[model samples]
Target: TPRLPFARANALAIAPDYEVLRSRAPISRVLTPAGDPAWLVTSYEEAKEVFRDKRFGRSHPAPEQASRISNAAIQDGPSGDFETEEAEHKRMRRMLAPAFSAPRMRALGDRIAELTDRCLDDLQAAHDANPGAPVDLTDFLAFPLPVLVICELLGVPYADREHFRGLSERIARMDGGEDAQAAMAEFKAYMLKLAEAKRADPQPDVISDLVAVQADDPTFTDDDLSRMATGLLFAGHETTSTRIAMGTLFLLSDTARRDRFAADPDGEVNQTVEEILRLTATSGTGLLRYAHEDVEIAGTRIRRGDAVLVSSDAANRDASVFADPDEFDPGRTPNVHLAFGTGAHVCIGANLARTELRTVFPKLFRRFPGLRLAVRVNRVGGVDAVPVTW
Candidate 1:
């Protein structure tokens, strides 16, 4: 069987193995990075089916015996209480959904735009400081923008970014071992303390809202609040930052696309963001789900307790679903990519992430229409730094 997270040829390319396997079948048996067997779903249809299927979940009936996907602290193994997973999921969503609703996100668009401009101002300053020298957008813009937004929205101090960001990075390490666990514990503790402060003096933020609601819901304890807060912080910034970096590379890599965006930003920004979301292959490992019971999909039977890996990156590129799958067509119509996933567990921060992306791209490009990569980026691992110049 093939290994999970098939190798990619380069930063901007998907694993060629995806196409070969996708052609053979939508779902196939494979060995996970952890060396455990799993059903890898690559095709768009089958990937969505797995996502939408009620029989599969993040929690395993017996987590101790469940197959792990990696050594990562997050999403490596099963999570949540097996029996209460569905109910807990619903409760979490109910509490958090309003904070990230479309209208609320739209309302925050102006704030995001303001923040984007500030970051661009800094980038421009950095560029002016060293005439024609490559300034790292990763540092000035991509990384800081999302961090600022999430910190303000979550009521966490932006001054504490480096501390929590260090812990967040450790917690995301696949091979972090004891360090990852310690980092998670530290992160949870930090959030728990912040949540307590919010309880003492509530703020206009998500954590404060949750703290207020938790007063009525006795079961939503401090631990739950802390975990949820940590998740929000970790997820809210990491992926979106990577996307900003990748999206910049994508937009600037082609002169034609770059010029089009510069000429008509508002007209082209939405589709451009969607295309970026669809095409950016930030992670090799896909989302993991376990079979709560025996299930069959796409002529493949997944036994109870079996692990399922859904490659959204591969699914977005399935030729049957997207024409010229490899090509980045900004205005591709009817683009129903699963970048934020679908079904009951779709990304709660989807609107928030989109809002930031849509706000940032136009402002950044309009400010520096001549922006291009300062150096050849060989790989995009975590997108730490994207050197660019006019």
Candidate 2:
């Protein structure tokens, strides 16, 4: 059987093999990166089914027997307790809902805009200092904006970004084994201490709110709060940083699209962000779920405890659903892309992500309308650096 995460020609494009496989059938058996048997769901309809069905879950009844998608500490294999997974998830979301509520995200908009402008000011200064020389937007804008925003929202000290960012990178490594596990431990420990500090002196941030919840609910342990904090810190910035980078890449890659966006950023920003979300292929392994019970999905039988890898990248590009699947159409309406997975586990930070993207893109292009990639498009995906010349 073919292995998962098929080779890609570039960062922005999905492997052509995925389209061929999706054309043949929505679901097919494949070997995971960890070399275990699993079912790969490549079409929009079936992928949504897997995400929505209660019979499929992030946990397995017996985790040791579960098929792992990677060797990474994060998202590599089964998570949560099998029997109580649903209830636990409900609790987790309920606790987190207030912090990430749309209203709160909207309230944070002014601050986000200010921070974004500040980053842009720095970029502009760099550009003015050495005219026509490339400046790495990833350092000035893509990385620091989210890090600053997330740090403020989570009440984590911005001074500690270097420590946590390193830990986050380690945890993201697919081939990282013991090193990843150790990084996770250090990350949790850091969050635990931060939680303790928050408990001592409560603040108007998510960690402090979680600390208050922990006091009210005994079941929500210190460890739980710490773990959740760790997740918030890791995902809150890392994913958004990549999106900012890739969104910049997508916008700059096509001059016509870039001009359209730069022409009227306010009118065009939302759809452009949606299209970026829909098109960006951030992960090759997709999402991992295990069958809690035997389920028939699109005429295929997924037996109890079987692993399923749902590819949102492939699903978002399903030709039947998206007209001109590969084309970048900012005006593509009724675009029900599953970039953020549907159902209970849909990204908790979706609203915050949208707010950040909406705030950043318009200002970015308006300020640097001449911005063009300093390197070839294919070399621009990594969050380390996105060199641009204006």
Candidate 3:
């Protein structure tokens, strides 16, 4: 905040920090705590325009030859097998997209609501047993909802979460650099084991579909199969976890908003949901992409291989685009946020996340009418909180 201690981006500071972006440093460079300098972009229009520009994609000049963005090359525009990256990304995304389609997601709704009810029932039980008990809603609701939902969708065994959850969490953090790398190696092994079993016998699950696709396509190599499933598992939980945490934080921060959200329930809930996403949608912009070739924009010359950092949260909160950018108004009109991203690369899992929230939120409010923060707000992690409550 002081810029002396470079805490990575946090949802709490998003509005003010974005004001800083728009008013002061629309485009500025920073050195990662890990000792690498990279550019940051947070202006709304600039970010939205950058996402649509054709010149930038996930490729770049060789890492050694290019300006280093951070210690983690994978995050700072990873260089995969260039010839196969797109084909693999597409084939795998296409393979997984159906699992997250509207029809499939709708099919998931009643089941999800049922899953949510069980958790709420558990929360009620916990709270009643100790009535004013400040139950960690993060435990019963935020974390488990998506983790269980994704595992069920992928048909991964729930019993095994204890075996992998901690490691998986590590793999999700930017600071977990070396630990994340090591954790991924372990996770890759587990996914391969899953792939082999599903190959022998298929089921109505994402992994089985991946196994089947692997059978049909020679390009879906062992490495590819492992990478694909693991990616889904990571995506399936990470963003939703952030959404639930920051989303709930916003709701519990004010009773008027919470009561308003609960009163109309579904009728007003969608707006509330979008508002929560817009307000707490802090995933630090999105990943950076490199301009495939030199491009000139707004008369600012960006050379080939220069990284473009797109901020959906910034775009979603721009006053020029969204009315009253600083406030969380669920009833606000013109409230289109890029929290789920956009265009072809738009997150396909958005429908599933939406269904989970839609089912859970109203039911959750109904269960805990008095839900409030369990600890001081400052105690929660900046980038993402491992602590929160209803």
Q: Pick the candidate with the highest TM-score.
A: 1
Give the per-residue lDDT of model 2 (tens digit) for 1-390: 887667766656778777888988899889887789999899999999888988999999999998887765456689999999999999889998878876667767777999999999999999889886999899899988887887778877767867766766676553447897788788778778888888789876788889889889998887888778777766677678888988998988888988999989999999999999998776657788999999887778999989999988889999999989988888897877898899989999888889999999999998887889882121112464788988
The C-alpha lDDT values of all candidates are 0.83, 0.83, 0.66
Stretches off by above 4 angstroms in model 2 are 158-183, 375-384
* Model 3 misplaced regions, further than 4 Å: 1-11, 24-26, 68-74, 82-86, 173-182, 374-390
Write model 3 residue lDDT over 99-216, tens digit each, in one string.
7766667767767888888877776676667755567666666777787787677766667766667656766564546787888888788777877778778766777887888778
Model 1: lDDT of residue 67: 84
**Model 3 / residue 177 / CA error / Å:** 7.7
Q: Which of the predicted structures, 2 or 3, would earn the higher lDDT when compared with the native?
A: 2
Determine which window of 10 residues in candidate 3 has minimal summed lDDT. Answer: 375-384
TM per candidate comes to 0.93, 0.92, 0.86
Score candidate 2 by lDDT. 0.83
Q: Write the per-residue lDDT of candidate 1 for residues 1-390, one digit (tens) a residue.
A: 897667765567777887888889998888877889888888999999988999999999988898888765456779999999999898988998767866656656777888899999999999999996899999999988897787767777767867866776777554557887788888888888888888889876788888887899988888888878877876777789989998988887888888989999999999999999999876656888999999977889899999988989889999998999989998898988999999988888898898899989888888887889871211123565789999
Query: Between which residue pairs do clashes occur in model 3?
Result: 371-390, 372-390
